[PDB]
Ligand binder design. Structure first.
Ligand code: CDL
Ligand code: PEE
Ligand code: HEM
Ligand code: HEM
Ligand code: 3H1
Ligand code: 3H1
Ligand code: BOG
Lengths: 101, 48, 146, 380, 61
């Protein structure tokens, strides 16, 4: 039953961050872990993520969006940060637990 | 209950005209400056 | 020098047949681009408004010598002749150049710099870690008063 | 040394370092213009205020007639009175949008800037309240009576706390003079804290609609936002003046045209429009202390927002469910205001308790819940 | 060409710019005032004391 898929893909188009050309991960709010993760991004993946963002801001100041064609597609969204971030949060839980011992 | 009445409305008139004229002038000036950013074009040319 | 504004800077008056480019170019560290740019436009405005006779006197003598060092060899003199006919039409003698250079004074400099610089919309090119330098709108406002 | 006298001077380095060379996100929308408008109001209120204070007379036997004289006799007094009273309203309108913006765009993640904000709100409220009491009209009085009476709900130190408040054993002259003192003072404390509000801000910088770092794209406050704010000013100013000049009393209760009567509480006693929503909640809980607590919490609940944030994203721009909930909440307050302006009779009473219950749930339970939910739908 | 004539003479020099704003504001006032008052009084013919006035003003006794 492709329900969860059906839903996720729906919510994805609902959000609309793809209309700006941002990957689901370019929208994460930068708390402490996210900040660390980003420092671990390989030069190129970081420079691309930057442009995507600097481009979305420029869109927002102009009050426009990308022509439908260039919109990110639910299945082509690269979760470029997701795995780094999970490790950062895993390294952190270890420390946290180890200091209570 | 309010002797000003008449003068209060004569003012309201002057206020609309100046307000009209002024909001316009400043709307232009605001757009004028901002144009620099409105028309702006950027491209990502990573080295290869 | 006082403030360590740059690594180098240079004025330039590139000319062409019908047009031209009159400006300046400086190199600096990311964190001082702003002040340099600031002082720089500042000195341009000082040209259009308060140039003195002392400044022009030296200016002339410095130009005269550079004008002569232009012809320091056969290659250079040949280059002058080649480019003079091709651009100015005929050949312009040093005795002539020098007469024109002496004709200049304060009032002239001010009236001319004001002619091509004051309140004009300039062209900008920035390359490198240029974050500290910013907004055309600002740079533009540096073209008057200052 | 410092070349320009804009970056070195111990003072101009401030006008310049906090409003001219200030780094601002290039994409802040009109919802960010309320900061300045709020600021401008403060200066306008304070100014028109002094002008009035120079003709008012804090004394029961003279308050009402002083204001009346201030209008009918003082040159342009009538205009100044208007501007001051209607500024109070546009001040609140602005502050409410200023808050909404913060809520909708997760600016509350800027905790200190936010908490000082809430403090500001409470202060502005207390101020506008006591101002409204000075003309010593019917609302003036009964308002003074009910609000100071609120402390009476605090056990023990309660019934005493009321004694100071009044300076006697029932509202009277002392209350009116210590109220004028209080009103005269607070605005400055507002201006003071506003400085801090803006200072904490500056540590981080402004937020922006998409809620993602705008370091890759900042711009100098001037002339971008200085011009944008001048314009945003001439816009708010138009209806503020259209209102104050063409329909003066549109926004205000008329009971205050009747000199206070210690023996008669008007049957249609409502507070100024900007307090209704709370007045509405107070009239929900049919118990002295409960209503009081609900009232307190109706504003103090703002302190909890920062802690009830579950979304992995900062704003609601890309959260369609939070949006609906957010707008459902706005309409929710919009209702309480209507309720606050109606009598304590069916169907109102029931609709009332609902909207209140609704208000506190959308904030303490829903939002944080839908938020978590949304995170899962993104696969986080 | 006024735009050029104006720019060159008024708007260029930040000092003449000010003189224009002052000199202008003065003219603008005197005229905008009459006009508005004129529009207002017209919109209220026979209702203002300016109109009624002649009936008692040195007309009786
Ligand atoms: C004049 C208002 C602009 C009209 C408009 O909707 O522009 C559309 C359009 C511009 O299109 P656009 O560039 O895509 O619009 C982007 C911005 O919204 C273009 O707008 P903007 O960014 O240039 O201007 C922003 C402005 C826009 O003003 C409004 O939204 C109104 O908002 C403010 O400055 C904020 C002030 C709010 C004050 C309200 C006071 C509260 C009292 C409440 C009672 O202008 C026209 O169609 C030309 C009309 C002349
Ligand atoms: C408390 C008592 C206050 C009394 C009630 C006053 C309510 C006045 C009527 C409602 C006024 C709101 C005007 C509707 C504006 C419609 C609009 O523009 O909505 C869409 C628009 C676009 O969203 P984005 O995703 O960011 O766009 C970028 C990508 N394209 O949304 C926004 O403008 C953001 C929301 C702005 C906040 C306005 C909320 C109104 C104020 C209410 C106060 C609420 C807070 C609680 C206060 C407790 C005390
Ligand atoms: C005296 C009352 C107030 C004044 C004069 C004031 C002033 C300012 C100013 C000028 C700004 C900067 C511009 C802007 O972003 O709007 C600002 C930002 C902000 N204020 Fe206020 N404020 C007031 C009340 C409040 C209140 C009541 C809150 C909280 C409920 C609040 C929350 C904020 C926050 C969160 C910011 C950051 C906005 C952002 O994310 O960009 N302020 N305020
Ligand atoms: C925080 C900014 C201010 C707010 C919110 C405010 C609000 C009010 C309100 C709501 C009233 C009642 C208006 C009416 O309906 O008649 C009022 C009146 C008054 N305020 Fe303020 N006020 C402010 C600042 C000031 C200050 C600092 C002064 C003087 C220095 C001042 C002096 C007065 C006086 C004398 C009155 C009473 C007479 C009248 O109503 O005209 N106000 N104020
Ligand atoms: C109070 C104010 C501006 C006030 C005036 C008074 C200027 C000093 C000169 C011209 C004007 O008339 C503005 C309204 C701005 C407040 C203000 C801020 O403090 C900050 Cl940190 C930011 C990021 C913004 C962004 O929009 C802002 O508007
Ligand atoms: C809205 C409110 C109280 C608001 C305060 C007390 C906040 C709870 C805290 C900060 C303040 O200073 C406000 C004035 C009380 C309700 C309320 C009023 O406002 C007013 Cl004017 C009146 C005449 C009544 C009469 O019954 C009332 O019940
Ligand atoms: C931003 C809007 C500003 C509006 C300015 C209008 C100035 C009010 O103008 C007033 O008009 C009255 C009757 O004509 C005169 O009696 C007053 O002396 C005059 O100041």
């Amino acid at each position: 039953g492709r329900l969860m898929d059906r839903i996720r893909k729906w919510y994805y188009n609902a959000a609309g961050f793809n209309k700006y050309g941002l990957m689901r991960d370019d929208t994460l709010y930068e708390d402490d872990d996210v900040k660390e993760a980003l420092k671990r991004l390989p030069k190129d993946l970081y420079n691309e993520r930057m442009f995507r963002i600097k481009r979305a801001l420029d869109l927002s100041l102009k009050h426009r969006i990308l022509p439908k064609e260039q919109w990110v597609k639910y299945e082509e969204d690269k979760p470029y940060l997701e795995p780094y971030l999970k490790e950062v949060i895993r390294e952190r839980l270890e420390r946290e637990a180890w200091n209570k011992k | 209950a309010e002797p000003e009445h008449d003068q209060r409305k004569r003012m309201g008139l002057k206020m609309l005209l100046i307000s009209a004229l002024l909001t316009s002038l400043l709307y232009y000036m605001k757009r004028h400056k901002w144009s620099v950013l409105k028309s702006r074009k950027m491209a990502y040319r990573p080295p290869k | 020098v006082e403030h360590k504004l740059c690594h180098s800077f240079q004025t330039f008056n590139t000319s062409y047949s019908d047009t031209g480019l009159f400006g300046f170019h400086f190199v600096a560290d990311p964190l001082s681009i702003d002040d340099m740019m600031f002082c720089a436009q500042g000195e341009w405005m000082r040209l259009c408004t308060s140039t003195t006779e002392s400044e022009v006197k030296r200016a002339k003598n410095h130009l005269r010598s550079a004008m002569v060092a232009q012809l320091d060899g056969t290659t250079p003199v040949c280059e002058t002749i080649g480019s003079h006919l091709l651009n100015y039409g005929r050949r312009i003698s040093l005795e002539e150049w020098d007469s024109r250079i002496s004709a200049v004074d304060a009032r002239m400099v001010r009236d001319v710099c004001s002619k091509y610089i004051y309140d004009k919309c300039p062209a900008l090119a920035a390359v490198g870690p240029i974050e500290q330098l910013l907004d055309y709108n600002r740079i533009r406002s540096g073209m008057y008063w200052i | 040394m410092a070349p320009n006298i804009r970056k070195s001077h111990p003072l101009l380095k401030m006008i310049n370092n906090s409003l001219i060379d200030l780094p601002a996100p290039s994409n802040i929308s009109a919802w960010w213009n309320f900061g300045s408008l709020l600021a401008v109001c403060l200066m306008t209120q304070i100014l028109t205020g002094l002008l009035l204070a120079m003709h008012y007379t804090a004394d029961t036997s003279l308050a009402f007639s002083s204001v009346a004289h201030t209008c009918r006799n003082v040159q342009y007094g009538w205009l100044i009175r208007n501007l001051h009273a209607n500024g109070a309203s546009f001040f609140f309108i602005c502050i409410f949008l200023h808050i909404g913006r913060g809520l909708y765009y997760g600016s509350y993640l800027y905790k200190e800037t936010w908490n000082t904000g809430v403090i500001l709100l409470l202060t502005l409220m207390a101020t506008a309240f006591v101002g409204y009491v000075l003309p010593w009209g019917q609302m003036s009085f009964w308002g003074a009576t009910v609000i100071t009476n609120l402390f009476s709900a605090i056990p023990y130190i309660g019934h005493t706390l009321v004694e100071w408040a009044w300076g006697g054993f029932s509202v009277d002259n002392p209350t009116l003079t210590r109220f004028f003192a209080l009103h005269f003072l607070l605005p400055f404390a507002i201006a003071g804290i506003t400085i801090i509000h803006l200072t904490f801000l500056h540590e981080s910088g402004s937020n922006n609609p998409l809620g993602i770092s705008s370091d890759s794209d900042k711009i100098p406050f001037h002339p971008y936002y200085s011009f944008k704010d001048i314009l945003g000013l001439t816009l708010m100013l138009t209806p503020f003046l259209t209102l104050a000049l063409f329909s003066p009393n549109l926004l205000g209760d008329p009971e205050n045209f009747t000199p206070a009567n210690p023996l008669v509480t008007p049957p249609h006693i409502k507070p100024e429009w900007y307090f209704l929503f709370a007045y509405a909640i107070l009239r929900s809980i049919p118990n002295k202390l409960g209503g009081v607590l609900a009232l307190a919490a109706s504003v103090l609940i703002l302190f909890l927002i920062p802690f009830l944030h579950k979304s992995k994203q900062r704003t609601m721009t890309f959260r369609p469910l939070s949006q609906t909930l957010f707008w459902l909440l706005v309409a929710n307050l919009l209702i309480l205001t209507w309720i606050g302006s109606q009598p304590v009779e069916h169907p109102f009473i029931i609709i009332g308790q609902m909207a209140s219950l609704s208000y506190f749930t959308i904030l303490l339970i829903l939002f944080p819940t839908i938020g978590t939910l949304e995170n899962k739908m993104l696969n986080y | 060409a006024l735009l050029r004539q104006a720019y060159s003479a008024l708007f260029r020099r930040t000092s003449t710019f000010a003189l224009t704003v002052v000199l202008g504001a003065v003219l603008f006032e005197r005229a905008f005032d009459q006009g508005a008052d004129a529009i207002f009084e017209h919109l209220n013919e026979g209702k203002l004391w300016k109109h009624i006035k002649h009936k008692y003003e040195a007309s009786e006794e």
